[PDB]
Design an enzyme around this catalytic site. Sequence first.
Site, PDB file in Angstrom:
ATOM      1  N   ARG A 249     -11.889   0.621   6.563  1.00 26.28           N
ATOM      2  CA  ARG A 249     -10.579   0.668   5.981  1.00 26.28           C
ATOM      3  C   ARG A 249      -9.554   0.660   6.833  1.00 26.28           C
ATOM      4  O   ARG A 249      -8.347   0.328   6.313  1.00 26.28           O
ATOM      5  CB  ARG A 249     -10.907   2.107   5.094  1.00 26.28           C
ATOM      6  N   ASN A 250      -9.425   1.012   7.795  1.00 24.37           N
ATOM      7  CA  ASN A 250      -8.460   1.055   8.864  1.00 24.37           C
ATOM      8  C   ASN A 250      -8.408   0.137  10.056  1.00 24.37           C
ATOM      9  O   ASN A 250      -8.011   0.393  11.231  1.00 24.37           O
ATOM     10  CB  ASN A 250      -8.378   2.569   9.507  1.00 24.37           C
ATOM     11  CG  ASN A 250      -8.356   3.785   8.599  1.00 24.37           C
ATOM     12  OD1 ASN A 250      -7.480   3.510   7.522  1.00 24.37           O
ATOM     13  ND2 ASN A 250      -8.961   4.818   8.773  1.00 24.37           N
TER      14      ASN A 250
ATOM     15  N   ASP B 236      -3.561   2.606  12.250  1.00 25.67           N
ATOM     16  CA  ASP B 236      -3.417   4.035  11.882  1.00 25.67           C
ATOM     17  C   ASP B 236      -3.917   4.660  13.218  1.00 25.67           C
ATOM     18  O   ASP B 236      -4.244   6.133  13.156  1.00 25.67           O
ATOM     19  CB  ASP B 236      -4.241   4.323  10.546  1.00 25.67           C
ATOM     20  CG  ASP B 236      -3.219   4.039   9.566  1.00 25.67           C
ATOM     21  OD1 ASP B 236      -2.093   3.813   9.551  1.00 25.67           O
ATOM     22  OD2 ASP B 236      -3.893   4.396   8.435  1.00 25.67           O
TER      23      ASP B 236
ATOM     24  N   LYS C 299       6.939   0.233   7.331  1.00 24.07           N
ATOM     25  CA  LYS C 299       6.542   1.455   6.774  1.00 24.07           C
ATOM     26  C   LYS C 299       7.613   2.295   6.820  1.00 24.07           C
ATOM     27  O   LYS C 299       8.578   2.146   7.736  1.00 24.07           O
ATOM     28  CB  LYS C 299       5.499   1.870   8.041  1.00 24.07           C
TER      29      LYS C 299
ATOM     30  N   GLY D 292       0.943  -1.282  -0.063  1.00 23.72           N
ATOM     31  CA  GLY D 292       0.090  -0.025  -0.134  1.00 23.72           C
ATOM     32  C   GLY D 292       0.790   1.401  -0.075  1.00 23.72           C
ATOM     33  O   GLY D 292       1.955   1.131   0.205  1.00 23.72           O
ATOM     34  N   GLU D 293       0.378   2.299  -0.160  1.00 19.87           N
ATOM     35  CA  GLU D 293       1.263   3.510  -0.363  1.00 19.87           C
ATOM     36  C   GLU D 293       0.433   4.930  -0.124  1.00 19.87           C
ATOM     37  O   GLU D 293      -0.634   5.195  -1.193  1.00 19.87           O
ATOM     38  CB  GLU D 293       1.981   3.421  -1.912  1.00 19.87           C
TER      39      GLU D 293
ATOM     40  N   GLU E 119       2.981  -5.391  12.889  1.00 19.83           N
ATOM     41  CA  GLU E 119       2.593  -6.701  12.556  1.00 19.83           C
ATOM     42  C   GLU E 119       1.942  -6.623  11.190  1.00 19.83           C
ATOM     43  O   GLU E 119       1.506  -5.619  10.795  1.00 19.83           O
ATOM     44  CB  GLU E 119       1.561  -6.865  13.617  1.00 19.83           C
ATOM     45  CG  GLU E 119       2.151  -7.180  14.985  1.00 19.83           C
ATOM     46  CD  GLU E 119       1.121  -7.396  16.029  1.00 19.83           C
ATOM     47  OE1 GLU E 119      -0.083  -6.749  15.793  1.00 19.83           O
ATOM     48  OE2 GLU E 119       1.010  -8.145  17.054  1.00 19.83           O
ATOM     49  N   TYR E 120       2.232  -7.646  10.454  1.00 20.38           N
ATOM     50  CA  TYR E 120       1.533  -7.851   9.026  1.00 20.38           C
ATOM     51  C   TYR E 120       0.156  -8.491   9.275  1.00 20.38           C
ATOM     52  O   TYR E 120       0.028  -9.466  10.313  1.00 20.38           O
ATOM     53  CB  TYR E 120       2.427  -8.580   8.303  1.00 20.38           C
ATOM     54  CG  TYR E 120       2.045  -9.374   6.939  1.00 20.38           C
ATOM     55  CD1 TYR E 120       1.749  -8.569   5.627  1.00 20.38           C
ATOM     56  CD2 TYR E 120       1.614 -10.751   6.743  1.00 20.38           C
ATOM     57  CE1 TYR E 120       1.232  -9.009   4.509  1.00 20.38           C
ATOM     58  CE2 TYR E 120       1.504 -11.252   5.635  1.00 20.38           C
ATOM     59  CZ  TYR E 120       1.238 -10.285   4.462  1.00 20.38           C
ATOM     60  OH  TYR E 120       0.439 -10.806   3.277  1.00 20.38           O
ATOM     61  N   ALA E 121      -0.693  -7.772   8.449  1.00 20.59           N
ATOM     62  CA  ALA E 121      -2.208  -8.364   8.157  1.00 20.59           C
ATOM     63  C   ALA E 121      -2.453  -9.012   6.827  1.00 20.59           C
ATOM     64  O   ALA E 121      -2.477  -8.361   5.951  1.00 20.59           O
ATOM     65  CB  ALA E 121      -2.845  -7.254   8.300  1.00 20.59           C
TER      66      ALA E 121
ATOM     67  N   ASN F 163      -7.796  -5.046   4.851  1.00 20.04           N
ATOM     68  CA  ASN F 163      -8.588  -4.225   5.664  1.00 20.04           C
ATOM     69  C   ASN F 163      -9.663  -4.866   5.481  1.00 20.04           C
ATOM     70  O   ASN F 163     -10.203  -5.644   4.725  1.00 20.04           O
ATOM     71  CB  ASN F 163      -8.530  -2.974   4.962  1.00 20.04           C
ATOM     72  CG  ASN F 163      -9.309  -2.426   3.817  1.00 20.04           C
ATOM     73  OD1 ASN F 163     -10.469  -2.900   3.883  1.00 20.04           O
ATOM     74  ND2 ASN F 163      -8.565  -1.977   2.901  1.00 20.04           N
TER      75      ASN F 163
ATOM     76  N   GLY G 132       3.633   7.960   2.067  1.00 19.22           N
ATOM     77  CA  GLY G 132       4.529   6.726   2.464  1.00 19.22           C
ATOM     78  C   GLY G 132       4.325   5.494   1.778  1.00 19.22           C
ATOM     79  O   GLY G 132       2.978   5.411   1.297  1.00 19.22           O
TER      80      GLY G 132
ATOM     81  N   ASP H 173     -10.367   8.618  13.118  1.00 17.38           N
ATOM     82  CA  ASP H 173     -10.652   8.263  11.785  1.00 17.38           C
ATOM     83  C   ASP H 173     -11.023   6.582  11.827  1.00 17.38           C
ATOM     84  O   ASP H 173     -10.710   5.874  11.000  1.00 17.38           O
ATOM     85  CB  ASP H 173      -9.341   8.362  10.719  1.00 17.38           C
ATOM     86  CG  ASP H 173      -9.772   8.029   9.359  1.00 17.38           C
ATOM     87  OD1 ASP H 173     -11.165   7.961   8.859  1.00 17.38           O
ATOM     88  OD2 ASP H 173      -9.151   7.969   8.373  1.00 17.38           O
TER      89      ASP H 173
HETATM   90  C1  LIG Z   1       0.827   0.533   8.319  1.00 18.19           C
HETATM   91  C2  LIG Z   1      -0.258  -0.290   7.849  1.00 18.19           C
HETATM   92  C3  LIG Z   1      -1.552   0.104   8.653  1.00 18.19           C
HETATM   93  C4  LIG Z   1      -0.600   0.219   6.229  1.00 18.19           C
HETATM   94  C5  LIG Z   1      -0.513  -1.191   5.827  1.00 18.19           C
HETATM   95  C6  LIG Z   1      -1.082  -1.501   4.441  1.00 18.19           C
HETATM   96  C7  LIG Z   1      -1.191  -2.832   3.949  1.00 18.19           C
HETATM   97  C8  LIG Z   1      -0.750  -3.756   4.701  1.00 18.19           C
HETATM   98  C9  LIG Z   1      -0.340  -3.478   6.059  1.00 18.19           C
HETATM   99  C10 LIG Z   1      -0.148  -4.534   7.248  1.00 18.19           C
HETATM  100  N1  LIG Z   1       0.313  -4.119   8.671  1.00 18.19           N
HETATM  101  O1  LIG Z   1      -0.284  -5.776   6.853  1.00 18.19           O
HETATM  102  C11 LIG Z   1      -0.491  -2.312   6.667  1.00 18.19           C
HETATM  103  O2  LIG Z   1      -0.202  -1.645   7.670  1.00 18.19           O
END
Ligand SMILES: CC1(C)Cc2cccc(C(N)=O)c2O1
Length: 266
Positions: free
Chosen positions: A146-147, A160, A47, A22-23, A95-97, A101, A25, A142
Site C-alpha cells: 500500500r505504501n 510515507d 501534499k 488521495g486523501e 515525485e508523482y507515481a 500503489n 491531508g 509501516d
Molecule cells: C504523498 C503520497 C505518498 C500520497 C500519494 C497518493 C497518491 C499519489 C501519490 C504520488 N506521489 O503519486 C502520493 O504520494
Amino acid sequence: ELPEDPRWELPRDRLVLGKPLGEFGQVVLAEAIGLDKPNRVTKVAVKMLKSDATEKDLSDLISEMEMMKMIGKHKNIINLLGACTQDGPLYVIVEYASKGNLREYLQARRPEQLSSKDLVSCAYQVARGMEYLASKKCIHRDLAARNVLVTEDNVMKIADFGLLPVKWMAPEALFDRIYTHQSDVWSFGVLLWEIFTLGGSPYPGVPVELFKLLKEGHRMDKPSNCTNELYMMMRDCWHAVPSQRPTFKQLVEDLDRIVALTSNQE
Ligand SMILES: CC1(C)Cc2cccc(C(N)=O)c2O1
C-alpha cells in the site's frame, strides 16, 4: 508561520493544480513549471492540509518535509522536489507515481500480466529503497505494498517513510511497540508475500488472535506460484529473533542474484 528555505521553495504560481490523487491531508496531481533550470512542465504530487486541520496536522507535515530534506535522494523512494511555504497553505511537492500503489498495481495484473522476473525485480527495487533508508537511519514503521508507489516507468518507490497494519508488524513492535530496522525487515517479508500473491491479503480469515498465533510460531504459507528460495527469504524475514533476520543489505544481494537467475520467459 513558516520559515523559508531557498533550497526547496518554488513560487506558488509555477504550480498548476490538477486532479486529486488521495486523501489526514489531500494529495493533488499538478504540473510544475520550471522546476529544473525553465519552460518545461513536470507532473508532480502535491501534499497539503485538509480543510479542517488542527496544528497537530500541520506540524507533522512540516516534519515529514523536514525529514525528506535530511534523508536525500534515491531512485526507489518518493523524493521531495520542493514546497510552497510562503503566502498561502503549505504545499509539499514530491515525485508523482502514475500507476499508484503496488497492491493495486499487482491486483490489476492478476489473470497487463507480470512475468516471473518482473515480480522479483519489483522486490529487489523495494529492497534497495529500504536499503537506502536504512543506511540513512530511517525506520519506516509501516512498510507495505500500500505504501510503495509505482511510476509511469514501473519504478518502485517507497512512500510515507517520513511520517489493518497490525498484520504487517513484527511481533516485538506489535507487543512492546519497539520498531527497528529489524521490524521493518519483518514488514518486508509480508510485502514479499503480497508480491507473489499479486496483492493478496495477509492472514486471510485471521481476526486481530494474531498476537498469540504469532507467538505460537504461526507463519503464512507459501503462495501458490512462488519459488522455495523466496519462501525461505520471507521466512528468514519473519524470524522470531530480530537479530536473526537478514538485513536489507543482504536482502539486496540475495534478490540481485535471484533476479539474475530468474527466467524472463516464464
Ligand atoms: C504523498 C503520497 C505518498 C500520497 C500519494 C497518493 C497518491 C499519489 C501519490 C504520488 N506521489 O503519486 C502520493 O504520494
